[PDB]
């Protein structure tokens, strides 16, 4: 599973692009 973050990836995550959704930018992480 990959997910939108903010403010960041977590634990053992690592970030793979953004994520634009509800007027925001999000860290796009797996």
């Not at 599973?1 to 970030?15: D, F, L, S, T, V």
């Amino acid at each position: 599973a990959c997910y939108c973050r903010i403010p960041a990836c977590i634990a053992g995550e690592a970030a793979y692009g953004t994520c634009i959704y509800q007027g925001a930018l999000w860290a796009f992480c797996c």
